[PDB]
Amino acid sequence: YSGRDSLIFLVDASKAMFESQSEDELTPFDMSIQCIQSVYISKIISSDRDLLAVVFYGTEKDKNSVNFKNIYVLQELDNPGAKRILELDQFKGQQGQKRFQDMMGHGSDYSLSEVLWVCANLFSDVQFKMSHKRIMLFTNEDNPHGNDSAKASRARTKAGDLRDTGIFLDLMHLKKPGGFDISLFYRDIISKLEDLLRKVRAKETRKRALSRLKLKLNKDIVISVGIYNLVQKALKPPPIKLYRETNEPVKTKTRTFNTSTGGLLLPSDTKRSQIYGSRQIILEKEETEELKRFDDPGLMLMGFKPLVLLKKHHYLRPSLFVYPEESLVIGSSTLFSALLIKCLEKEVAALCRYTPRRNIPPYFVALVPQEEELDDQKIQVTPPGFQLVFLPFADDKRKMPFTEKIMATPEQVGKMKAIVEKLRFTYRSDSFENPVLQQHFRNLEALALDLMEPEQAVDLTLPKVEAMNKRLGSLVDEFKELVYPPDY
Amino acid sequence: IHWPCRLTIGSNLSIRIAAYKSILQERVKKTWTVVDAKTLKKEDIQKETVYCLNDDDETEVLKEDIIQGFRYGSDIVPFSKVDEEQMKYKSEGKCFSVLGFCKSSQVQRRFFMGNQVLKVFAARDDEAAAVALSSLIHALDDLDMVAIVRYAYDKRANPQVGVAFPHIKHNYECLVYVQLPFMEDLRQYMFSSLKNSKKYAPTEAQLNAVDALIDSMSLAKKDEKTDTLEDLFPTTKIPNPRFQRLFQCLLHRALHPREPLPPIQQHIWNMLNPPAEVTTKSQIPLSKIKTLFPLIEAKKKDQVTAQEIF
């Protein structure tokens, strides 16, 4: 199950947003435009599969297909592309606002029944499963007055109908943020605009669930668990192929050539070998593939190993989050509810032979019960399950000389304890993004609209400790009781 | 290998050091190379391609008449790495810029990226560095500290963060290093509560029989009153079975290729079995568990078709 998320944004046209908010600051129109650049960038950098359409109401002209009065669409339900961003961004500020108004409409009345009408009819046209659906609003009206109470009541009925349908309403204050001046009676028909503005960048999410793994703890019992890859790098957008000016990719006829015939290597004519001493030891890719067969894809459990005996010096591939499940074998999660309840003998690690893929050797792994740290705000921290650390082999070692050469004086430990105690970090995990990847993103948006570069910054990986030293006190230099400086 | 550098804290602290890549999986040392089948040399080994253009009419296009476009939303934005090299991210390299210090209680094994361990020690002509290093590792052990060090190997390398801690012991005061993640190095799926699963709660009889399994289980035993836990199957002394299997199989071809290469040999599996007493004493708990827990299975397995006619 994947689904989708349909998002539509509506703006009135009554000069209540074409106005400058009685300030040199951004207009409600302009702040909505910056919000929509933020939304479009966020959608592009995240899964862009979601469709976004542009529709405006309260307008002198009509280009909605239904052609009801005071409704003017611009964009169909499409993934936000570069051209969409340019065509919406060409209409902002005073000059963009006025040209947009003369090509769209400078402002007129609202017909709520008509707009709910057209939204239901349009959302009918979706041809795919819809995981979520939401409509965000940004309008200054406290409550419907211009429309008669008949239109307000029928809009209330349709609003209840759509709320039961699944779609929900969102709004923010416009006349004055904070307090309560908006939705006094929209309280019945039912900062934060900054979050709708540009706040979060380089987003991505996954709704998948890795395959059912079969615990081969013994020949008699094989059980079903759900593995889950919970950590991996986010990658570089692919250099998909193109052309100088026609802007068109290339295929490939990549095949190794043979001096004998004008043709290429035949799959027989290509033949594997290796120089061992005086031998071109002769094999094929088939033989090398056949060599690596050890046993079936799965975990061939050697057995439990008391986790009370454990070490931190060894390190390997980042861990894998296994989870209890009952997919194709019964009683699975019945016994999976066990082994997470005791930390005296059920915390015991599981030294296991684990083959992840067909035709793969067994790889040593160990189990850690990761108790659902269900955060107090319900945010199940360290979700309920298993942290799996892959165990070393006898080639994870390059020998090191002994460095136990000194155990220095207590004066040095005291001074550097004083030094380091003045700095402690709450360990915010999200505190540093990828500056390299974000800089590549910035190169992309530079090539997007017109910029030589839109943003020239680091993701805060640069050392602020040039100001921490005085914050900690320059005493770090006077706590050098060292007679000779190391860096000379 | 010896790798010298200078760690930095702020813009005033600089200590000449030396780094060594220590925990590195050894892989194939002679990566298999390709020859002809009827002559067994690189007399027929060449390449033919210029990456013909993808079109409606595929035109044989040069490798320089072409753009490395990029997936950008719903299109392919033209681009060349010559553009990157002039406004890409500019990494400094050969630096150990220490960004901060957090609580050792805050870092977790779940927050470890990478594959390896880097031992870092102060460079020579620096004895003050050595005494300060030992004293500061004492201080850090006292105060439960872990350092944030944005580290870059060289002009080639990007920021590679990580933390190294001293293995304080009578033996080497080595620096066990681990690479650290970012938020793009982590995901968080949804996992329903299980101990509350009424349909799937473990019965107390099954729980006690599972405890019987665990007691009958014994791999890291405890018989030494000197507080010594003895494991009878370590993983750090078993290298890639790829190497042993490759050698044993190769033996035939190196000597006489005609007959099939030797199998993986029962001895190799003998190095992959625990004390049989453990399995025997677990069998009674194993039997009582396999009787106390019901299972169902569906078979989607493969069969060998290279099959003996007898």
């Binding site: 979520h132 970090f425 915010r428 999200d430 | 968080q188």
Partner: peptide, 23 residues
């Protein structure tokens, strides 16, 4: 339930970066 990302409900509303703190 609250605490879920507005763009992708079911995944968490992650607070933005805050850098390193000095105590």
């Amino acid at each position: 339930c609250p605490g879920e990302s507005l763009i992708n409900p079911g995944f968490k509303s992650k607070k933005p970066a805050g850098g390193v703190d000095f105590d």
